[PDB]
Structure 1
Amino acid sequence: APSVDYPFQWVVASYDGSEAKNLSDDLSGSATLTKVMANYRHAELTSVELEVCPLAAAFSKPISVSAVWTIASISPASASETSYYGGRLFTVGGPVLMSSTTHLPADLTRLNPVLKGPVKYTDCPRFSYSVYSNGGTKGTNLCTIILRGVVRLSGPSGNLL
């Protein structure tokens, strides 16, 4: 079946260290990807990764974020991402807002790349992260969580234009 590799990117959420914020999301049910896959019947993840970009305000005040790419069935709790395989702890800020170590790629060999199809899969990739309570300012938004990846979309459906 003919298909196109569709690259996507969006800032998942901007965060400040005012309080701990936990977000766990399944890529099959994400609102901003379902609009991309609404026009196609089949979608398979070629690649995807979670990026934590530091912002300039984080230079003097780092933020620690614990992130993990788990299976759709498993939903890790808040501040428990490092207890699962592949769970990493990213400290953004300090004097070096340069390192690319803040990338967390999804191991699509251990996950089901199919985000859409004839059936709803229970093994789709699900990204869960938790931002810890830092000093906080309530307005700086000195951290950013971003998703980028590629989805192979096939079988366009007769949806709205």
Structure 2
Amino acid sequence: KQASIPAPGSILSQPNTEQSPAIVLPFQFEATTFGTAETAAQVSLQTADPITKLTAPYRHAQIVECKAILTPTDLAVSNPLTVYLAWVPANSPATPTQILRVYGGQSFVLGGAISAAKTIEVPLNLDSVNRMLKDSVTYTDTPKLLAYSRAPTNPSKIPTASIQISGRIRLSKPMLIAN
């Protein structure tokens, strides 16, 4: 009844290396936006500063859930824009232009065209990439989103979208950073 009720209680996880119980740390950010410029950036769900800014204190991490929504700002109503999306590992020559031609090809508009409430909400199939966001090894099959818009005559400066990739991820095995 002293210090054993119940003494232990270790129910750690194991994505690729059995380590202490990883805590599901969620995140939200826009690796790339599209509004007043030829949108065409290829960001990965691994090199992203935000993710790397939370997985550094540890050694290994495995994304348990990831998404990508498009939030059309107050603009786009008078200056619409077609945002292209698609999920694919770091590998594969899947270029922004090759979008739509690759499984998971998405394409919507902004303004009077259904784009506001309920958001776009584009989940990422873990069966299409790798969960190991960071490990002792170097995985090349890591998640990676694609985006394109071209942006016609919309020199309104302020972006018309946001394109944020959220989700949660577990991380274990300390890395003893600065502190």
Q: TM-score, normalised by structure 1?
A: 0.90
- Paired residue for 1:21? 39
Q: Deviations over 1:40-73 (max 9, x none)?
A: 1111011111111111111222210111111221
Distance 1:51 1:9 in 2: 10
Distance 1:118 1:75 in 2: 26
Among 32, 36, 41, the alignment partner of 2:59 is: 41
Q: CA deviation at 1:101?
A: 5.7
Structure number with bigger Rg: 2
Could you list the structure 1 runs, at least 4 aligned residues long, displaced by more than 4 angstroms after superposition: none
Q: Identity of paired residues, percent? A: 26
Distance 2:46 2:148 in 1: 20
After superposition, residues 103-142 of structure 1 pair within 5 angstroms as 103-142=121-160
Q: CA deviation at 1:144?
A: 1.2
Distance 1:9 1:88 in 2: 20
1:8 aligns with 2:27: yes
- Paired residue for 2:107? 89
Provide structure 2 residue ranges, at least 5 long, that are not aligned to the other structure: 1-18
Bigger shift: residues 36-45 or 126-135: 126-135
On the 8 A contact 1:43/1:152 being kept in 2, the answer is yes
Distance 1:77 1:123 in 2: 15
Q: TM-score, normalised by structure 2?
A: 0.81
The alignment yields a C-alpha RMSD, in angstroms, of 1.7
